[PDB]
């Protein structure tokens, strides 16, 4: 796969697309939870050579626009994109579940604590500008889930559904990794899946990003000590806890703070 | 057959069961009590077979007599499981649940009517009197009705730990069976649906009714839900579903609801009760 | 068929309880996997006393599989050929090798870390993964690591029994719910009253008694301690701390018990 194809403006999407390539979707039927404006669908179809891509989104206008972008960005593969229409939260319509049940791989880069602070505004404008062009939501809470203790409730809710509807399907998801890979792997093991980390990158966190959640979390987990994972350099050589990274920023407003993003595949037994 | 407008929670449950499509099915009810729902499911719903159990060991025998009177024709077709059965936690109960197409229940939950235990007490001793026994006041279950072991459940945070506990058991023991449960909906329909989705079931709301909550009902539990933080310690949006009118047109938060009763202690406050069927994939 | 009293561990009442439950479990002729093999004594016990057909297992520390192998060979030479440990640093069963073995096992067994374990077990002299299991619903009673194992055993070996050793200060209703919440029908195979080491911290259990329910909201809950060794006189966790306060050397007891979780099935 060539370098040009991975999103060059958003490291999270880039991390997610380099992992989808490594996942090996060629000839498979894939389902994307949260297609948005379909750029990832175009990528999976044109670059990963997926046989069939379906998907849905919470906002029901996006399916229309995803199709449009796919026709424009992957015209020779566009006929293989069959979105599920409607306002679909996770996979919660009969239509969505039917297609999920027929999928080999379910993929998603889903809301989570630690996501870029501007991702919602971005997503919203993105819609509009395409929704002709040529406010919700509402991004739910999923507070009941055990792994919402580390900000991953929505991702756990999806795994509960995937296991039930498509028990033999892989599930490939993108994650901020400040809580560490043991926690990330536990999310999958708790829910019937063997995790494999397909890919990871050190990414720059936007200036002014609030990391108070991660500082509080690592205070709560000490008894060996648990520490959140941040980095002081883009090579990820200088390690920092949430507390040290916040301390750095308290001093120098312009301090560069880095963290990992990584794609993990869950595979059932 | 009258519905008894005195007990809207039960009326909602039974209307839901009628809609669940139990005809020719084999049903297990968790918490049979004196068997009124059993008789309803046999006589009105036309279930092929009904079984069930109760935490109070004295109720299966009493329920057995009672359905005989209530539904003399099809009073067999009812085979209760004996003993003090919590949820379905005996080998006889599990064996019957494994053979059932549908498990139904109107189970203890935060937000249940405050007079629910007194009503069950009175219903049992009424039943024992119709059966011809002049008994002592031994128609009340004592400690057990435990809550502690259900406290760890994710959905215990919204008062439904016991219901989630049941879903863990029904999925394992009868992976193909529907589970049809009655709920007070003060915590919201979306939360009630997540209870099923989180545990392997696709929920469908069979029936719902707006019901008036008793004047002295404390609702600070639901107010606290609206002020609590997420598990993350970050602020959370959470709005409970109350209403101001018996048609359910005026919506009210728990905070809003508690304001009115602070203003006018006599104010009427309503909420939804709904029957939700969980269906496995 | 004499009771093999000689064979049970005389040194550790927790291990003694485990082994007594393991003989009651009926492992004869079966394929058994032990999480946390340690030195291998339990394996030797299961081979030589329980007549397991085959035994495998793993430990978090990769230098212990070899040591276990050594002691199984020295303690059960004529059965040690039935021991096939999984090498490597294996947390729970989280390698492909471990997983393949578990999937072929009739029974998974373990005496796993948990809040309330003796303070000295940690020391070796021969946890540590822990934070990742903080989110489990039963970590509220200090059993999150055990809950994590039950999530894996159900998925990897949905037909296998799981036999686990437990301190029962939180009481048997809670211990049984850990299994019922996770797809297993529990059965208490064996239990004993043990003496907790003078000076053991039970702040955790006192906190459980003074806690508002998750709701929450009132919660009436009492831990199970004992004042004697026959478990005749009951004590709450608060009452037990109170005594340790009155006496530095007050003797405090609690139950240890072995529970088998059987899928249903
Ligand atoms: C902006 S992305 C999530 C952020 C993530 N950190 C990232 O960079 O990819 C959100 C997309 O997923 C969709 N989405 C959000 N919540 C969803 C849900 N619960 N179910 C399905 N789609 C959802 C949104 O409509 C939007 O198209
Ligand atoms: C307690 S009521 C609840 C009724 C429901 N809230 C309503 O308002 O209509 C239902 C029956 O369940 C029984 N019950 C209570 N706890 C139980 C448990 N853990 N397992 C089984 N049955 C139980 C009670 O004896 C009673 O007979
Ligand atoms: C802490 S000791 C057992 C504590 C237990 N409560 C007791 O009283 O015996 C755990 C044994 O299992 C192993 N072990 C500890 N944590 C483990 C883990 N996360 N996965 C697999 N084995 C583990 C250790 O090497 C040790 O051999």
Author numbering:
A (entry chain A): 13 to 146, 158 to 246, 251 to 296
B (entry chain C): 16 to 296
C (entry chain B): 11 to 136, 159 to 297
Paper lines:
MmtN is an S-adenosyl-methionine (SAM)-dependent methyltransferase family enzyme.
The electron density map of the MmtN-SAM binary complex structure showed that one SAM molecule was positioned in the active-site of each MmtN monomer, mainly through hydrogen bonding interactions. These structural observations are consistent with the biochemical data showing that MmtN had a relatively low affinity for SAM. When superimposing the structures of MmtN and the MmtN-SAM complex, we found that Tyr160 formed a loop region (His158-Tyr162) occupying the binding site of the adenine ring of SAM, and the mutation of Tyr160 to alanine greatly increased the Kd of MmtN towards SAM. This loop swings away from the SAM-binding pocket in the MmtN-SAM complex, indicating that it has a gating function for SAM entry.
